[PDB]
Amino acid sequence: AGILFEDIFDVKDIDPEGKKFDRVSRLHCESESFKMDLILDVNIQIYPVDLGDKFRLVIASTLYEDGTLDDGEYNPTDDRPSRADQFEYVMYGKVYRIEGDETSTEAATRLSAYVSYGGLLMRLQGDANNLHGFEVDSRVYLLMKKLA
Amino acid sequence: IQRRLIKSMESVMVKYDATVRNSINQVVQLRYGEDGLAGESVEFQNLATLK
Amino acid sequence: QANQKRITTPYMTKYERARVLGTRALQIAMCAPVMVELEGETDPLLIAMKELKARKIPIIIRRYLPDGSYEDWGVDELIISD
Amino acid sequence: RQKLLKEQEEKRLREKEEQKKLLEQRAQYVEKTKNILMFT
Amino acid sequence: DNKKKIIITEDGEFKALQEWILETDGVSLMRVLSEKDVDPVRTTSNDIVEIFTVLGIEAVRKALERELYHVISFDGSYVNYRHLALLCDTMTCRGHLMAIT
Amino acid sequence: EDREVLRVIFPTGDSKVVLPCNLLRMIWNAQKIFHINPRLPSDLHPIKVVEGVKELSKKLVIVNGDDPLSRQAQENATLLFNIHLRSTLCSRRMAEEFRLS
Amino acid sequence: DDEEETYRLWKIRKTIMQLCHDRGYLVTQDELDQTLEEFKAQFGDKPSEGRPRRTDLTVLVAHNDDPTDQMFVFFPEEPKVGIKTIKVYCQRMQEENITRALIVVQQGMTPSAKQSLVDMAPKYILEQFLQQELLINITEHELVPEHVVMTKEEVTELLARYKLRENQLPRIQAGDPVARYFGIKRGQVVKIIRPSETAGRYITYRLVQ
């Protein structure tokens, strides 16, 4: 499939530290199916998000419904079936950090994957079982859709 | 002050035996900067075992 | 001085590179034979840099030591960094 | 522990060398006092 | 911390002891050093000529490096140490204080 | 031993030093060039780290010569850098911090 | 008036013992670190009346390498030492067959006495020290690096390694405080080992003048 992670999140706070940027807003959200915290930077100018909203987030390694790698190059004249068709807000970034609660001897029970979508930062932290698809310096997509 | 400093140090040079010497061939430093390294390539770092 | 043991650096200094390139460029400009092949180069400086990259400059650098002796290094014997 | 014992007896040898040097300085000071006596 | 007493604790950490220090308006380094309860190891002066007369050529080399560094860095600037070292070696390589004049 | 040598060189606890090669930046460059995974166990033998650092230290020559005087001057010229190198390219740091291959 | 006098005498003796030890003379650890109370026990705590008299403070050490190479340390009573006192000390050195001495004066030394100390050098190498400059050991100062008198073999090895003449080394005056502490004459080279913030350690070599 090419999907590293999928869950439904609920916006629990927007800009706790205050609005830092005008067109960008930080959402602190939590899901229900996996109990994962999410910090996400979104362009609220084009895709406004209100407190208490509920959305489906899908971290993917590729947009093509069939398992097929991406070249990281912009190809607007691409007629293949892309899973971005099923979502409203889509970003493209790279994983730049994977933290955990590991010790010198024990493995990590909880992980924390950090992604940068051209400067818009995301932190998806929760159980390490749900974050095996994430590897540092790896390109991913956001694929986020609002639901009622 | 600038002119005085220049005229005082103008002929001090790194020689091919890597010593720093003046025009009289007297030895000012056995190695430039005590380490024989040029000042463009060095940079700030931290000694991890000091503190 | 024993050529079997030369104490100076095995690297070409920036000043040695500068003067060797200038000298060889003047020699080329004065109709000296070129040691490397040439596609379309007509500037003596470009030809001299190509010869230095190819390690085919027929010049010996006589490095003087403070004691008065000297060490002769072929341009092909030195390590070209830049 | 056996190596600990070897290092311990080595320290004993070094302290014994300290004692032999101390008595050597005594053996030369007993010469030096007569010179200090005829000095003044 | 540049004038505090930096020691190494028994645990191996650097600790800055907050101690009394005196700053005089004149210099008699020769006499002040030889006073009871005065530290003859860290007590210094900014008069490089007295440092040369009391401690010698390498002491004045080091002190002169310190004073030039203090003059350069007081405005937050930074100069590579090899330049100060070369200037200070030029002024002290002949056994006396060679003024740049 | 290098720690005690640094402690007598820098009597104030200032680890900021000016040295040729930015070893942490080179380690980061190696991590990114070879796609080092910090979460997986490494295939670098700590004995290889020790031997490689020793051979490297032998190859960094400021003072050339096999005579004992040249040996001591070589020791002194690269002392601080070799301490920085041995404390940065340590086998433990290379095993649980940098995790290089 | 008196406790400080014995304190000064003890401090001067301590610096002299450290000096002789650094010159390579045989000094026992006991006298090398002698407490002030031990000094009072061995010499007294009333120098003003005559216990100790400075003539009792005289030191006589022997070199570690040569037991016959001894050295005196005299403590003249007069503040300004005169030529007659120098002649007396030279006479004593002739009697005891000693060739090196230190004279720790209090106030100074007369010009005739200094000229006498200078002219008869090839016979008796006897030096002049102020008690004011022996109340501290300058080699313990943080500014003073580690000085080491090199041997003629070491100096030859140095000049052969760096392939240079003695006039090309940096210099140190013969009247330098540290040169006088180590009692080094012209023609000798002193190796200075100092810490360097760029290299860790740095050895330089200064020729005595």
Curated annotation (Swiss-Prot), chain D:
Protein name: RNA polymerase-associated protein CTR9 homolog
Residues included from the entire protein: 853 to 892 of 1173
Quaternary structure, from the entry: Component of the PAF1 complex, which consists of CDC73, PAF1, LEO1, CTR9, RTF1 and SKIC8. The PAF1 complex interacts with PHF5A. Interacts with KMT2A/MLL1. Interacts with STAT3. Interacts with SETD5. Interacts with ERCC6.
Free-text function comment from the UniProt entry: Component of the PAF1 complex (PAF1C) which has multiple functions during transcription by RNA polymerase II and is implicated in regulation of development and maintenance of embryonic stem cell pluripotency. PAF1C associates with RNA polymerase II through interaction with POLR2A CTD non-phosphorylated and 'Ser-2'- and 'Ser-5'-phosphorylated forms and is involved in transcriptional elongation, acting both independently and synergistically with TCEA1 and in cooperation with the DSIF complex and HTATSF1. PAF1C is required for transcription of Hox and Wnt target genes.
Top-level taxonomic group: Eukaryota
Tissue-specificity statement: Widely expressed.
The species this protein was found in: Homo sapiens (Human)
Subcellular location: Nucleus speckle
Curated annotation (Swiss-Prot), chain E:
Function: Catalytic core component of RNA polymerase II (Pol II), a DNA-dependent RNA polymerase which synthesizes mRNA precursors and many functional non-coding RNAs using the four ribonucleoside triphosphates as substrates. Pol II-mediated transcription cycle proceeds through transcription initiation, transcription elongation and transcription termination stages. RNA-dependent RNA polymerase that catalyzes the extension of a non-coding RNA (ncRNA) at the 3'-end using the four ribonucleoside triphosphates as substrates. An internal ncRNA sequence near the 3'-end serves as a template in a single-round Pol II-mediated RNA polymerization reaction. May decrease the stability of ncRNAs that repress Pol II-mediated gene transcription.
Coiled coil stretches, renumbered: none
Domain notes: The C-terminal domain (CTD) serves as a platform for assembly of factors that regulate transcription initiation, elongation, termination and mRNA processing.
Membrane spanning residue stretches: none
Entry's family note: Belongs to the RNA polymerase beta' chain family.
Subunit text: Component of the RNA polymerase II (Pol II) core complex consisting of 12 subunits: a ten-subunit catalytic core composed of POLR2A/RPB1, POLR2B/RPB2, POLR2C/RPB3, POLR2I/RPB9, POLR2J/RPB11, POLR2E/RPABC1, POLR2F/RPABC2, POLR2H/RPABC3, POLR2K/RPABC4 and POLR2L/RPABC5 and a mobile stalk composed of two subunits POLR2D/RPB4 and POLR2G/RPB7, protruding from the core and functioning primarily in transcription initiation. Part of Pol II(G) complex, in which Pol II core associates with an additional subunit POLR2M; unlike conventional Pol II, Pol II(G) functions as a transcriptional repressor.
Residues of the full protein shown: 1315 to 1415 of 1970
Protein name: DNA-directed RNA polymerase II subunit RPB1
Domain of life: Eukaryota
Record's subcellular location: Nucleus; Cytoplasm; Chromosome
UniProtKB/Swiss-Prot annotation, chain F:
The organism of origin for this protein: Cricetulus griseus
Coiled coil region boundaries: none
Domain notes: The C-terminal domain (CTD) serves as a platform for assembly of factors that regulate transcription initiation, elongation, termination and mRNA processing. The trigger loop allows entry of NTPs into the active site, switching between an open and closed state with each NTP addition cycle.
Function of the molecule: Catalytic core component of RNA polymerase II (Pol II), a DNA-dependent RNA polymerase which synthesizes mRNA precursors and many functional non-coding RNAs using the four ribonucleoside triphosphates as substrates. Pol II-mediated transcription cycle proceeds through transcription initiation, transcription elongation and transcription termination stages.
Gene symbol of the encoding locus: POLR2A
Entry similarity comment: Belongs to the RNA polymerase beta' chain family.
Boundaries of the shown chain within the full protein: 961 to 1061 of 1970
Intracellular or extracellular location(s): Nucleus; Cytoplasm; Chromosome
Assembly with partners or alone: Component of the RNA polymerase II (Pol II) core complex consisting of 12 subunits: a ten-subunit catalytic core composed of POLR2A/RPB1, POLR2B/RPB2, POLR2C/RPB3, POLR2I/RPB9, POLR2J/RPB11, POLR2E/RPABC1, POLR2F/RPABC2, POLR2H/RPABC3, POLR2K/RPABC4 and POLR2L/RPABC5 and a mobile stalk composed of two subunits POLR2D/RPB4 and POLR2G/RPB7, protruding from the core and functioning primarily in transcription initiation. Part of Pol II(G) complex, in which Pol II core associates with an additional subunit POLR2M; unlike conventional Pol II, Pol II(G) functions as a transcriptional repressor.
Descriptive protein name: DNA-directed RNA polymerase II subunit RPB1
